[PDB]
Symmetry: C6
Subunit: 288 residues, 6 copies
């Protein structure tokens, strides 16, 4: 909804947004949204996501598709009216994104999703990119393990000419929605096929905000499907735009740069990553 | 409405237009339109705004959606006819923009919205743009607070990979509508996802006049995403075209340039802003 | 309808076309067509113009929309059949443009509209253009007053981020119809939001002929919103095409070139305008 | 239909095609097709031409629009079946072009339409073009008179910002069809607006063959709506393609070059034209 | 049908393919397909070809249109099923191309169509192209006669501004169909208007295999219309792709180069043609 | 479905993926999946593939089209629901690709298909490419035989101007289904007419994963029909994207590079092929 600020309450927000990244316990926002989600009544819509054609499918708190749902209105703090209605398997009325308030007054945050190797990582969408083919898949899985910590991470597979990979977009969003509803660390390998359809364009528009709001992290591979000259800057600008954090390869082998947005209007942080391969191409990220 | 002029009546119009920026009381046009709006008969449609489809949703004075409206007609001074009709939650007959006359004969103005640090600021649309990653968000919020003055400014958030950010265009225009109906100073962060659907084209075309007519100011953020080089003045001309004012960053860190259209056929004024950051990235615009 | 000529009738025609610009009293064609229009039996459709979708709407001589009109036909001298039928507020049968004969055997004329500064001005479409942001709005009004003479000039406002400006194209066409139906001298500010719908393409293509047929002049400004550089000539060839006259700025402040088409296959005349600003941006074109 | 040839009958065709241009009496093919046309039974379709949307309207030998026509089949010499059926004002079944055989065995000709100043001119489509604005309108009307000889020529007017000019495409094809049905020399001023819609594209595809088959000449103005550099070669190649003859302006004032296709696989002829202006811009083409 | 090979059966296929161009009797594959076609049961659909829409019209052995056909099914050697169904004059079920098996196991051939001047020519599609205005029409007719030999060649005429030239795409494909069903040597003049609708794309994609399967040759004319410079090998690669043979003009007046695909995976042969004109532009290709 | 991992399960997976290429018996994955397929209760849908329009068609294990299939669901270990429903010969509910589980927990594999010349070859999609017209068709067949081993290889033919080649895309997809359903080694000649429908885009996107899932190899040739120059790398990045393996020619006659993806995130292996021609263009790849 819309918010109102004066000098004093704006400073409080920025302090709150600062705290959501810098001082909160890693992963506490996810735990908090898990709570909001499970306090939602049986069969109530929680999430709508655009399919290939541009229609939206709707999910409940158990990641189950909502087939039919009688029109229902909710009056926000703002006067704002949210209408949800699902018919014939598709949202007749409503908006894409979370259909329940997960964030409240606390908007424009990059909730800290994890802490690893001395750095805090934001939730939201993290694009792993950089110059042509040199180890994007191994790095996302190593980030997934690292940011997973005590928890297993979720792996969503799409559009690679390898065994067991889904290539149907509608199955992809079903995967993604389930991943965001039930896990804090998600890996997408890869967005290559999404880059266009109205649902594909909707995905790049929504995934970052959905994740950030849930307090989960989505780490997605992005090979620039263009040349050796430039377009590591112009596909990277359909990235840096829709991304909460960017992870890019450097001139030095094994080395990556992380660029994080720490929240609305806050300073971007940059830090450096060293990695190396073990057996069966399993990549390790170095800590100390 | 079309209007007719000779030398004499045209000269009076221009004086009226000049006064509306230069000598009128800051924020007085807003107060006046507030009176026009509340004295309007109960149930009257007052504002129509394009949704993604290009269809138009319709609001009353309290920013409530108008679901069904029996065809009413109004005869203007020209002898021209204004027709509004709303059905199944969508305008069946009418035009985009205000449905009730706020301006009468007094058109082509940039009514003064606010005074600050020795400068008068225009109502209408204010695009904040320039060379990338350079502090657009902190600036729109500082200008928001500053021009709000005694009043809290409204914040419309859209299209960003942060928590609580709506990404559904149709919710966005519902936010826009509510803001202009109910507040003099409004902040949109950001226009990034609007820049194309028919609704997005309609928003760009309309908002500036909607705001100027109301006598409210809409301060919108805009990063050019196409290049780091020369598309700081080709997407910026999709700006200066649809903008009542432009605020662009300069060579000097912290410095911004304001370019103001002061009215129809009138001179464009320019002045500079000096800024610095406090804690939690809260920006201040310097005075005297 | 098609016309036939040998050497002799062709020579009479050109002579008559020549006369319609050079020797005919200024404004006389307008008066004549005002005669034909008012002596039409009310109810009759007189003008059809395309809306945004591409369908047409039909007006009578008092610039009222025609909702329903029972099929009627007229046989031309040609042996060709003219047909008009209106249903549900849209033209079921017919052509865009004038629906009653205002001219006669007399086609391909630029009927002299006004006389000022020792120069005759053509009716039809006048595009005011040239290098970026440099005095267009002031000039169209200065010109509008000067050609107005003893008469007030009509101002149609469209798509500017200023107060009271309609930004809905459907309303725009309605303003144009009424203006051409009721006034010899018309100003459009601005042609920018139209420059493309099927309706916007239609307006570009029809307005000139409509105006020249009526004997009124439409004075419209065209800011070349593309580049500083070489697209001062390629959107100006979107002008040079559908303009009866061009009014283009020079490299000398306050100075303008006027390019006039004096009629079908006749010579193009050029002359210069000197202007200066008074109080509140009111521009004067210098005379004697 | 399809034709079969061996060496001997192919040589006979070429001799016949040669004769249709070089030795036949000017205008005799037109007279011949006039005959075929008037031997057609009452209300039988003779000509179908594409409208704006791409549907086709149908005409009879009197240039009257055929509204309803019961399905009818004709068996050609070839085995080929022609089906014509008109419903609701539009051709339900059939093809664009002539719906009756005007040419027979004698195909691929440029029938001599006229003789003037010692040169033979072909029927078909003649595009008058060349570098930017210098006298295309006066030349088409002078060609019209010249090739008209003893006969008046027909003038079809379209899309110029001058008085009495039709700008509706559907009226344009109605004009054109009537012109080709009832006259040997036609002038179109101008195709500028047609250059795109499916009916516009159909026109450029069909007009040449329709005319050539009728033995009438269509002389159409074509201002290259592009630049001063080139595109007097690339708009000229949407010309030289669909044209039977081309008439182009040279470096020398008043001078034009005529390039004629004399028939299928026959040699192109080039000759030169000198012209000068008299009073009221009436152009004369010099003979001796 | 899919086919299966090992080393041995593949080697036999290639020998079979080699023979089909090099040692088979010229024109013998055509005679064979003529037998397959007439021994087909009465009323059987044999050929389906795309009309402008992309829909397909259907013919029987005598090139009669098939209006209505009860769903029939045929089980192939693979176990694959071929289904034909025709309704309201359009194929409701089936594929484009031949509907009856002309080739069996013998596929990937360029069956020898004709012998002339010491060279064997391939059936399939032959595009005649190269540097503009250079004698494409006289050449396709000379090659037509030459390769016809004892037999008359068929001429399909399309898209030219000459008398008797069909311009309706749907008639064109009816001509194409009749030609291939009924004659070994076919001449199309010209492909100019096909080069895009779905039908035009279908024609380009299909005709080459249709012709090669039948064992007929289609000699089509093609002037590149986009440029005088380098698009003699970028529209020519929309040629060499869809062509079984290429005939291109050279530096030397009268000289042409023939580039022949002799079969699947086989070598491309090249040889040159010398030509000169007789009377009425009748061209002769030189022998010995 | 989504999979979960910690460090330990991830390491087991990569090990298993490694095994599926390096140590597993060649062809063993195919045999397994042939097991799963035949042990499916007939009537069951096993494969859905998109036709030209974008809708999908569904096959059973004997590569027969499924016309009607009553709604059935399956619950995954994930908790996600799989659903298949076929109506009127098209898939009403479900995804493109395999409709029964052929893999297991085992995803992201390039299952070793064959062994030849001291090198293992991956199942999935193999694109044969490189500079213009230079031995592609011979190579795909040479490769097809070599990987065939004791088995015959399947040849799908499409869109070449040669005898017996299907050029209808709908038939093409049908050939592919049957081939993948019944054979370990498949050849496509050619991928040219597909390189775009919604179906052609779908085939590009799904074939690789289909093949790798099945354990068969599809060997397809891609002539870069664009340029001689720099588009040997941008349509090759339409290859590098959806290819399991690449086989690209060098500047040395008869020599080829093989680039293999050995599985998800694993190393890419490169090796060289020497070939030579025998009688009738039959190519051999050299061994020991
Ligand atoms: N042990 C290793 N040593 C060096 N490079 C490796 C190793 N394992 C994998 N790689 C590289 O990492 C990449 C694996 O990820 P993949 O998805 O195939 O490509 P990418 O993710 O870079 O687009 C390959 O490019 C491969 O060359
Ligand atoms: N205290 C600070 N010191 C320096 N730079 C800052 C500070 N706070 C914010 N910024 C910069 O201002 C921008 C914050 O706004 P953001 O939305 O991230 O980008 P944009 O400039 O596109 O609005 C960032 O580019 C960030 O680096
Ligand atoms: N007194 C003045 N002296 C010089 N220029 C002026 C004066 N008043 C207005 N202008 C100019 O006239 C223009 C106002 O017209 P506007 O509609 O903003 O742009 P356009 O030139 O496109 O019409 C501005 O460019 C402004 O600089
Ligand atoms: N008497 C004349 N002397 C010189 N030029 C003339 C004369 N009359 C007309 N013209 C020129 O011929 C043209 C008239 O035709 P028009 O339709 O206006 O342009 P065009 O046909 O060249 O596109 C004008 O460009 C005009 O300058
Ligand atoms: N006897 C001849 N001598 C020289 N050139 C000729 C002769 N006959 C025809 N031509 C040329 O051959 C061509 C005839 O074919 P046409 O369809 O006009 O052009 P295209 O070369 O595009 O097929 C023309 O370019 C013409 O100049
Ligand atoms: N004996 C041979 N020696 C050399 N090249 C050959 C031989 N036989 C065939 N070729 C080549 O193989 C190719 C045949 O394959 P084709 O399908 O025509 O083209 P592509 O290279 O696109 O597959 C031709 O380029 C031809 O030059
Ligand atoms: Mg990857
Ligand atoms: Mg910002
Ligand atoms: Mg202006
Ligand atoms: Mg002209
Ligand atoms: Mg030709
Ligand atoms: Mg090949």
């Amino acid at each position: 909804m819309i918010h109102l600020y004066d000098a004093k309450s704006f400073a409080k927000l920025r302090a709150a947004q600062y705290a959501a990244f810098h001082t909160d316990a890693p992963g506490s926002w996810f735990d908090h949204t898990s709570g909001v989600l499970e306090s939602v009544e049986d069969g109530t819509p929680v999430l709508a996501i655009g399919v290939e054609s541009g229609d939206a499918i709707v999910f409940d708190k158990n990641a189950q598709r909502i087939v039919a749902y009688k029109e229902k209105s909710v009056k926000a703090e703002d006067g704002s009216v949210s209408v949800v209605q699902v018919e014939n398997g598709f949202m007749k009325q409503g908006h894409r994104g979370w259909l329940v308030d997960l964030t409240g007054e606390l908007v424009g945050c990059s909730p800290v999703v994890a802490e690893f190797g001395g750095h805090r990582y934001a939730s939201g969408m993290v694009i792993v990119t950089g110059k042509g083919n040199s180890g994007k898949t191994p790095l996302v899985h190593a980030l997934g393990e690292a940011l997973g910590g005590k928890d297993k991470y979720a792996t969503v597979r799409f559009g690679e000419p390898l065994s067991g990979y889904n290539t149907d977009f509608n199955v992809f969003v079903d995967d993604i929605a389930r991943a965001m509803l039930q896990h804090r660390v998600i890996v997408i390998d890869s967005l290559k096929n999404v880059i266009i359809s109205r649902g594909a364009f909707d995905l790049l528009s929504d995934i970052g905000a959905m994740a950030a709001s849930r307090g989960c992290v989505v780490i997605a591979s992005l090979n620039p499907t263009s040349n050796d000259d430039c377009i590591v800057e112009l596909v990277k600008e359909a990235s840096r735009s829709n991304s909460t954090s960017l992870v890019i390869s450097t001139d030095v082998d094994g080395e990556w740069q992380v660029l994080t947005r720490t929240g609305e209007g806050l300073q971007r942080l940059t830090h450096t990553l060293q990695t190396s391969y073990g057996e069966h191409s399993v990549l390790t990220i170095h800590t100390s």
